[PDB]
Amino acid sequence: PVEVTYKNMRFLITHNPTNATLNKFIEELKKYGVTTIVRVCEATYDTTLVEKEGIHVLDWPFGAPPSNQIVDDWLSLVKIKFREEPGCCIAVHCVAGLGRAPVLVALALIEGGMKYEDAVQFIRQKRRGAFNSKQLLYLEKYRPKMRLRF
């Protein structure tokens, strides 16, 4: 798992767990203080146990760039969580490796004040292979709202 922090934000880009390894998964998320999981790819495990531990799971599946709705919901989540729950962490994962999980994190960083190249370097310092060709071109044309206050 790679962890990235900037301003009042802290994200955990993790791997997709399985029903059989949910206890260890939850145990680790709790140690990282995560109270929210965003699944941006296929949903492959039951969330009842996760939700009961106070960890809310969000399924925003999205190659194809995140829809404007997903981006808006993501930015709304980043805004409120790190404010209402100081020092918390938001986890994000795909299905096979990092995948597209780091895309939303980069968006949060850009929204935080970084230009896309900075966000990409910032993530790669933690995960060398982060972002493929298509994703870089997408991040390059992303027009941030720049409405988050810090």
Q: Which residues are catalytic?
A: 94
Q: Considering only CA atoms, give the Rg of the chain.
A: 14
* 100 carries a ligand binding annotation: yes
* 129 carries a ligand binding annotation: no
DSSP state of 90: E
Contact 119, 109 (CB under 8 A): yes
- Interatomic CA distance for residues 108 and 44, integer angstroms: 25
Give burial (CB, 10 Å; 0-12/13-18/19+) of 48. exposed
What count of other Cβ atoms lies within 10 Å of the Cβ of residue 138? 18
Give 22's strand partners. none
* 99 carries a ligand binding annotation: yes
DSSP state of 91: E
Known binding site for substrate: residues?
100
Known binding-site positions for phosphate: 95-100
